[PDB]
């Protein structure tokens, strides 16, 4: 066959269902109908205690657990991706995997609108030109056609420059560390002469 490439490669057995769920929802152009139908089901477990009894209670028979789920999802225009997923997770008793699929469905979705989050920490609050010169620095730290959003915080422990935090890497072009990276270079070099 031929499925779309998932943007991220993820972990296993709950992140592995979510990347299969993303791939059949990218084939059907249902990447946001399936996503909010997950988000409805997250809310459906909070309100109904007998719906979450179909995911935690081990003494629910599997013939009950797949017939409550199918006869409840037969209408209301749910995606055929969704009501096939939910009878599959109810066949195996994996309905409690659903908080963990929804989290990994988000990370595949947010890497599909290449929107990457950010946090910029500066010394004092920015100008409108200090904002524009900074994204020109910062979209050279995302390696594709990605867009950075931003989040602006302040720290006068920095002496100007900035710290960009991407939640999996940071880049420190602040001059408070440029001082320390200068000092330790000349504290190493006078000991080499």
């Amino acid at each position: 066959l031929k499925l779309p490439t998932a943007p991220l490669q993820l972990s296993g057995t709950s992140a592995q269902i979510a990347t299969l769920l993303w791939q059949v929802a990218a084939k059907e152009n249902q990447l946001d109908k399936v996503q909010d139908e997950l988000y409805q089901f997250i809310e459906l477990f909070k309100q109904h205690s007998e719906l979450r009894r179909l995911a935690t209670d081990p003494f629910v028979p599997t013939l009950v657990r797949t017939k409550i789920i199918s006869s409840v999802l037969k209408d209301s225009g749910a995606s055929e991706i969704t009501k096939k997923l939910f009878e599959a997770l109810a066949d195996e008793g994996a309905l409690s995997a659903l908080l963990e699929v929804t989290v990994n469905y988000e990370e595949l979705m947010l890497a599909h609108k290449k929107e990457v989050y950010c946090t910029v920490i500066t010394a004092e609050p920015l100008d409108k030109l200090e904002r524009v010169e900074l994204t020109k620095k910062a979209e050279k730290f995302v390696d594709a056609g990605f867009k950075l959003v931003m989040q602006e915080k302040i720290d006068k422990k920095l002496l100007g420059g900035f710290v960009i935090e991407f939640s999996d890497r940071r880049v420190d072009m602040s001059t408070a560390k440029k001082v320390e990276e200068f000092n330790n270079f000349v504290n190493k070099l006078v000991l080499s002469i």
Partner: peptide, 29 residues
């Protein structure tokens, strides 16, 4: 928190995706 029962899943099958892929793929047009 009332959703905290579902935060940690454990499965009865190591090959759970091989059953899930046999029901999600024929949901495609």
């Amino acid at each position: 928190k009332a959703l905290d029962e579902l935060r940690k899943p454990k499965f009865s099958s190591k090959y759970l995706i091989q059953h899930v892929s046999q029901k999600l793929i024929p949901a495609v047009k």
